[PDB]
């Protein structure tokens, strides 16, 4: 509710915090499965696509020992029939990776597919209505705003640049993804403070998952747990312990 005087930075989680879980789980990711075949058929000749496929081919070789692993075989020739089979293998492999737990090869192709979806106006990133107005006010009040999500930074930029509220990239000072560390590790938050160029105690982290909130608290970061429609429930003790907010408007600077 009321932010300590020492906070100069607000760090924001995305899923379940600024954006509904339903958008991420039921729209953003399913889009990839629905579109990977068409995307590969359409853009196969693009240098970037050839590079993405090479990365997935290398990853497929590394995963060959796994039960259920889908190989991405060497081509038989270079005719449209050979291409059809190759594309089906890449498609099957992408779907298999997604069906299991998130390799760099998979994320790389996903980011390029989303670039087309968002840039062409096929999809918009959903934000809860209280987010943009509060953020604008926080910045007016001098707060810096950074994002921390397991979603790649490149994908995060697409979400803010094509939101249901228009292009809101200017509302963000910087982005962090798993390259700086995993969200349930306190060391990640110590590195985030270093990257931003502040102290851990200058940060207020808003997130919906308690395991992330507790990791951040262990790093001497201030935390508030955000409750949105569809979030995993909080235990009684958690509701008592953590400062809860159901809207960004509830934060007072
Ligand atoms: Mg979350
Ligand atoms: Mg430091
Ligand atoms: Mg302190």
The domain locations on the chain are: 1-20+124-253, 21-122
Centroid of ligand 3 to alpha carbon of 201 (angstroms): 6
Q: d(Cα 187, Cα 216) in Å, to the nearest integer?
A: 9
Q: d(Cα 147, Cα 77) in Å, to the nearest integer?
A: 46
Centroid of ligand 3 to alpha carbon of 200 (angstroms): 9
Structural tokens at position 102:
């998130």
Pick out the residues of the known binding site for substrate.
149-150, 183
Centroid of ligand 2 to alpha carbon of 219 (angstroms): 10
| Burial 52-61, CB ≥16 within 10 A → b, else e | bbebbbebbe
Alpha helices in 197-244 (DSSP H): 210-218, 236-241
Pick out the residues of the known binding site.
13, 15, 149-150, 183, 208
Structural resolution in Å: 1.7
DSSP structure class, residue 51: H
Centroid of ligand 1 to alpha carbon of 135 (angstroms): 17
Q: 111 phi and psi, to 5 degrees?
A: -60, -40
The yes-or-no answer to whether 1-20+124-253 and 21-122 have a common fold is no
Centroid of ligand 1 to alpha carbon of 199 (angstroms): 23
Count of residues in the chain: 253
3-class state of residue 142 by DSSP? coil
What class has domain 1-20+124-253?
A: alpha beta
Centroid of ligand 2 to alpha carbon of 197 (angstroms): 8
Q: 187 phi and psi, to 5 degrees?
A: -60, -30
Q: d(Cα 190, Cα 188) in Å, to the nearest integer?
A: 5
Closest ligand relative to 23 C-alpha: 1
Closest ligand relative to 148 C-alpha: 1
Taking CA atoms, 100 is separated from 70, 95, 220, 231, in Å, by 12, 9, 34, 22
Say which residue the tokens 């005087």 belong to: 5
Centroid of ligand 2 to alpha carbon of 194 (angstroms): 5
Centroid of ligand 1 to alpha carbon of 123 (angstroms): 21
Task: Give every strand in the sheet of 222-226, ordered side by side.
Answer: 174-176, 144-148, 9-12, 203-207, 222-226, 244-245
Say which residue the tokens 């502040």 belong to: 198
Residues around ion ligand 2, judged by CB within 5 A, are 194
Closest ligand relative to 217 C-alpha: 3
Taking CA atoms, 127 is separated from 71, 100, 132, 135, 165, in Å, by 38, 28, 8, 12, 8
Cβ-based neighbour number of residue 22 at 10 Å: 15
Rg (Cα) of the chain, in Å, rounded?
20
Centroid of ligand 1 to alpha carbon of 14 (angstroms): 6
The dihedral over CA atoms of 124, 130, 132, 136, expressed in degrees to the nearest 10, equals: 180
Q: Could you tell me which residues are beta bridge partners of residue 145?
A: 10
Q: d(Cα 227, Cα 113) in Å, to the nearest integer?
A: 30
149 CB-side CA count, 13 A: 23
Closest ligand relative to 222 C-alpha: 3
166: left (phi over 0), alpha (psi -120 to 50) or beta: left
Q: 224 phi and psi, to 5 degrees?
A: -140, 140
Say which residue the tokens 């200017």 belong to: 170
Among 177, 158, 176, 178, CA closest to 168? 158
Instruction: Write down the experimental method used for this entry.
Output: X-ray
Cβ-based neighbour number of residue 152 at 10 Å: 20
Structural tokens at position 169:
């990239």
Closest ligand relative to 208 C-alpha: 1
Among 101, 172, 103, CA closest to 132? 172
Centroid of ligand 2 to alpha carbon of 172 (angstroms): 21
DSSP structure class, residue 4: P
CB 206 within 8 Å of CB 245:
yes
Specify the CATH number of the domain 21-122.
1.10.720.60
CB 147 within 8 Å of CB 196:
no
């Amino acid at each position: 509710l009321s932010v300590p005087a020492e906070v100069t930075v607000i760090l924001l989680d995305i899923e379940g915090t600024t954006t509904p879980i339903a958008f991420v789980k039921d729209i953003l990711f399913p889009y990839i499965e629905e579109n990977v075949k068409e995307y590969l058929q359409t853009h196969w000749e693009e240098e970037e696509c050839q590079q993405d496929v090479s990365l997935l081919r290398k990853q497929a070789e590394e995963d060959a020992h796994l039960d259920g692993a889908v190989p991405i075989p060497a081509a038989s020739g270079n005719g449209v029939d050979d291409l059809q089979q190759m594309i089906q293998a890449v498609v099957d492999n992408v779907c298999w990776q997604m069906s299991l737990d998130k390799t760099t090869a998979l994320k790389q192709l996903q980011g390029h597919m989303w670039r087309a979806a968002f840039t062409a106006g096929r999809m918009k990133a959903e934000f809860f209505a209280d987010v943009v107005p509060a953020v604008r006010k926080w910045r007016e009040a001098g707060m810096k705003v950074y994002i921390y999500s397991s979603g790649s930074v490149e994908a995060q930029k697409l979400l803010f640049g094509h939101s249901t509220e228009g292009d809101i990239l200017e509302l963000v000072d910087g982005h962090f993804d798993t390259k700086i560390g995993h969200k349930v590790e306190s060391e990640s938050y110590r590195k985030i403070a270093d990257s931003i160029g502040c102290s851990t105690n200058n940060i207020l982290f808003l997130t919906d998952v308690t395991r992330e909130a507790s990791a951040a608290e262990e790093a001497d970061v201030h935390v508030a747990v955000v409750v949105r429609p569809g979030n995993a429930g909080l235990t009684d003790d958690e509701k008592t312990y953590y400062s809860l907010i159901t809207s960004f408007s509830e934060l007072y600077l």
